[PDB]
């Protein structure tokens, strides 16, 4: 039953545990385990070897996006002379899936032979929680009381086990799926009701808008007035719009209450308002919580916040001398590099001697809807709480090429938010097609404090949308002490 | 026919034309007159109001490379599930055109507007030339004989009549065209010979492999080893194969010695190899040459270059204290944005007497090949001469979505170039999709004088293919006082 000592014991085989596991086996040359419940993608489990973000989250999520892309391609292809027959056009949605599962599989096979051919670093399946302070028990299941396949003893234990899926508990939970499900099923919907405001509900619901058959509908409802809370309120309103112009149904100010069955199967909505929809897929989005029930952190009182993630200081450290907690189990940004950066900065600092945190602060990130965004740093509601001037450098209109595509709506936004006393970027919002790959040297900006006129000194590169961040001179309009106006009082 | 005194009198009214035009007059409260010889884009003369850039450059090629690009995405689709006829697939070409003309018509009609509505903002149709150091004259034609339409008394004078393309002096060059009449092309060629190395014979060799009707085969000649000259060679090698890979013909170390027309209007091109090849069109692209013939410089004693641009120092000065150039007609940096910046600055430098400059070092550039080159700063062998230690750093992979797609062979690459000596970052070099959008924000980093180390420790955007560029720690090799080599002394 019990183990060799381990430098380090990893209990979750993703981005960060995987991140933190080969720095500490290549770079340091320390004994290490990992843990994780399959070495494959899919039922029962989603989740695998390789990360939420491998299975069932940004890598295949991306590659169905992409998919569904091709349905505004084919589309705006038209402007620019191409010519078929639009009603032999079908989108095989079993294609798409089994493309995806060989990508993802891959993956999964490619960390396999990492395993294999890297000397100290050591793959467990099972489930992994805590026996004590350098004990972690692997089990052949999430339930406590099943067969013991190994006891690892650890000198440092990282908790790396993420997050899942937030299900409410209303009447016929039973009858809707998540995101975890989405990834699998083996038809495409014609009606879906995606719940929630978040990424992860605006990208399935363009996802599902591409691939559904023909007289379907998608439709995306969330509790308050304006979805994507946290990013640039211009983006979340023109977001939404051209959602709406591509066909997706947004319900704000709407939550489901029950869900029922109707006698062909399909699923009856019925929403706190008294409003009715009947759908064949009820998509769950309204939020992950850090994953820490099968854990047993009470067998060694590892604090949890008062939310439920792990309670880590700024050096992803417990309580508990040597176990810490990295990536989407500490219920901060969920996203797979700030969890690749908290791994790498925690192997620094505990076998390097060397302490090392992480930024999390203007950090780059994207949504891809469609059109995608791409953001790094403060929003001006936030700015200008802040700081006492704030200036907001605004541009939008429709790229020349959707005048030609028939797609008028897809207007291109760009948004500056600056410190106005020194001209310091405190933020930068895009939407339209590229701004993820553009926000990328964004954060690398940032975090050289680039000023205002940093950007509009840069000579542009001609003709692209990024080169409207280097063609803004002037404040569009301010906040002084956290009232908006669009000039400055002498 | 001798005007009141222009503050600033622009000849060419494009890119750098009506920057300073524009700023000089809005900005100053300066009096401003600008020639140009045409009001809208196309034959006879091609550029117009708005320039090369908007009429027969830039903008255009972009929207074509955009509807290019669709080939591309219809093939592509297929891998992410998508079914059509195959079969009734077809490239409206004349529907092409037609958009891209009205597109570049309402650009020129708002370039008329600029000047309706703006104060001290005057546009005279016609060939500008230098008469006198204080006289610009206009007239009917670019020939010195034909008729006066007026003569402009000009405080200070610009020249800003940009390039032209050059073409070889070869039997039957008469035969051929440039870019300027490939985007007037009545239907597209089945059989293209695009003939030189440069950005703009690979653009449109990508824009005709896109639109050629059946049993259609596009070649690209150069007359030396690799095409793209000037772009880092991991990059030219690449795209070489990414060319090549989508069914374009690369004919390296050929140049035509004649061209000849066939009994059907098609045209036979003798290599000086003695290769032959029969082509609908041949498309000189083999250079751009400042456009000064016309401009009478002689009349006034504007110095020139030994290559023929106007000689400038670094503030757009010529020898002749009121007479200054910008743009391409300077024969450096042929980009619309160095155009425009150097106009910027001229107008800052002598009606706010602020002298400004524009700095051509690390200037973001593109290519709009398929697929697309991103750039900005050094090459590793200009870096080489120039840094004792130099590290490269090197990536090179097929995206994820690319092995769906079944175009295995789009590999994305992103290489930086450091000083290794304090890590400062001297060059940034991508090819794949998305290469101009992620390049530009680069050109920021590179004013701020980015390190590596910024690039590596900022936290990543996924999935990208620009956090490639935050994820290389370690040089693939280094130059050692000139001398490539794997690993440091
Ligand atoms: C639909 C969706 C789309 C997303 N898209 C993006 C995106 O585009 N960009 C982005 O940056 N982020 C995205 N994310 C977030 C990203 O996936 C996470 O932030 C990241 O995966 C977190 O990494 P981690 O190391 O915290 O845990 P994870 O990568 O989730 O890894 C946790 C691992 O632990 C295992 N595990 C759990 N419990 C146990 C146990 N008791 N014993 C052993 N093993 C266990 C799981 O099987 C899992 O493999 C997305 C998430 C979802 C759900
Ligand atoms: C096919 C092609 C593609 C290109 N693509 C890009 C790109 O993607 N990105 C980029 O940055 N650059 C590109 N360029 C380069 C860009 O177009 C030029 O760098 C830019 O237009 C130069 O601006 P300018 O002010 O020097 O002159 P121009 O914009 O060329 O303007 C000169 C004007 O002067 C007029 N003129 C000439 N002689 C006279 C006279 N005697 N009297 C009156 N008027 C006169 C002409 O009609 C013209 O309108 C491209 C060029 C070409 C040919
Ligand atoms: C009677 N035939 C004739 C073909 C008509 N069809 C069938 N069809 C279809 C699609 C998927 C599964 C089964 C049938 C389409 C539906 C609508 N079009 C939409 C094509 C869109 C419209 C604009 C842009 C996006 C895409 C582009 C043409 C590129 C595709 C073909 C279509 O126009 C088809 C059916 O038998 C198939 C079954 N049908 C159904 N379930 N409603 C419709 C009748
Ligand atoms: C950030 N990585 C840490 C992860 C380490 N490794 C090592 N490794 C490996 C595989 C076989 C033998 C030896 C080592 C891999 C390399 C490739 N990965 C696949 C990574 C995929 C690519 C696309 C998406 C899914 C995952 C993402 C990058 C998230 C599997 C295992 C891997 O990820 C740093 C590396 O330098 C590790 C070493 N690398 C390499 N040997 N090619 C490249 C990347
Ligand atoms: C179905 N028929 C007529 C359609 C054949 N054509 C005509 N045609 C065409 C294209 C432009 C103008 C005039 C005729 C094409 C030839 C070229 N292909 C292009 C294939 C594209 C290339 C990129 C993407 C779209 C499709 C993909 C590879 C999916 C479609 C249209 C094509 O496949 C074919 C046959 O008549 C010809 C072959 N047959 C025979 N030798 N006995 C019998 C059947
Ligand atoms: C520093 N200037 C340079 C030249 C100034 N003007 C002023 N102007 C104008 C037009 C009518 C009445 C008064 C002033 C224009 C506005 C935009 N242009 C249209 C040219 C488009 C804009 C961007 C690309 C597509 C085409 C390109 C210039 C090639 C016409 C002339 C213009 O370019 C830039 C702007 O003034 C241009 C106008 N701007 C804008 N509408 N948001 C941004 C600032």
């Not at 076998?351 to 602060?361: E, I, L, S, V």
């Amino acid at each position: 039953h019990m183990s060799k000592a381990f430098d380090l014991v990893v209990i979750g085989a993703g981005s960060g545990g995987l991140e933190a596991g080969w720095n500490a086996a290549t770079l340091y040359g320390k004994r290490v385990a990992v843990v994780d419940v399959q070495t494959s993608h899919g039922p029962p489990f989603y989740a695998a070897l390789g990360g939420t973000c491998v299975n069932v989250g940004c890598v295949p999520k991306k590659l169905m996006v992409t998919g569904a892309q091709y349905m505004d391609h084919l589309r705006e292809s038209a402007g620019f002379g191409w010519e078929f027959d639009g009603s032999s056009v079908k989108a095989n949605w079993k294609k798409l899936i089994a493309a995806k599962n060989e990508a993802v599989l891959d993956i999964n096979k490619s960390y396999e032979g990492m395993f294999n051919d890297t000397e100290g670093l050591d793959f467990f399946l099972g489930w992994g929680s805590l026996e004590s302070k350098n004990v972690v028990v692997v089990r052949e299941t999430a339930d406590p009381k099943s067969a013991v396949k190994e006891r690892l003893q650890a000198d440092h234990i990282l908790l790396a086990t993420g997050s899942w899926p937030q299900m409410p508990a209303i009447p016929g939970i039973e009858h809707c799926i998540s995101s975890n499900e989405a990834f699998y099923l083996p038809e495409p919907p014609r009606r879906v009701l995606t719940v929630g405001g978040g990424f992860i509900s605006v990208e399935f619901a363009g996802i599902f808008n591409a691939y559904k058959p023909p007289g379907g509908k998608v439709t995306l409802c969330y509790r308050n007035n304006l979805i994507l809370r946290g990013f640039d309120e211009t983006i979340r309103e023109e977001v939404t719009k051209q959602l709406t112009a591509n066909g997706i149904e947004i319900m704000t100010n709407e939550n489901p209450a029950k869900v029922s069955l109707n006698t062909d199967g399909s699923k009856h909505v019925t929403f706190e308002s008294g409003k009715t929809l009947d759908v064949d897929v009820v998509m769950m989005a309204i939020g992950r919580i850090p994953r820490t029930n099968d854990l047993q952190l009470g067998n060694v009182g590892v604090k949890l916040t008062p939310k439920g993630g792990v309670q880590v200081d700024e050096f992803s450290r417990t309580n508990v001398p040597n176990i810490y907690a990295i990536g989407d189990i500490t219920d901060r940004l969920m996203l797979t590099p700030v969890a690749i950066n908290e791994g790498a900065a925690l192997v620094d600092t505990v076998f390097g001697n060397k302490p090392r945190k992480t930024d999390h602060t203007r950090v780059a990130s994207a949504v891809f809807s469609i059109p995608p965004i791409g953001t790094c740093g403060l929003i001006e509601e936030v700015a200008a709480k802040e700081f006492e001037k704030v200036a907001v450098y605004m541009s939008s209109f429709t790229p020349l090429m959707h005048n030609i595509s028939g797609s008028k709506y897809k207007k291109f936004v760009a948004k500056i938010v600056t410190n106005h006393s020194d001209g310091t970027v405190l933020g930068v919002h895009l939407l339209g097609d590229g701004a993820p790959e553009i926000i990328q040297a964004v954060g690398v900006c940032l975090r050289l404090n680039a000023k205002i006129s940093d950007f509009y000194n840069t000579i542009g590169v001609h003709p692209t949308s990024a080169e409207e961040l280097c063609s803004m001179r002037t404040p569009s309009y301010y906040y002084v002490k956290g009232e908006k106006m669009e000039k400055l009082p002498d």
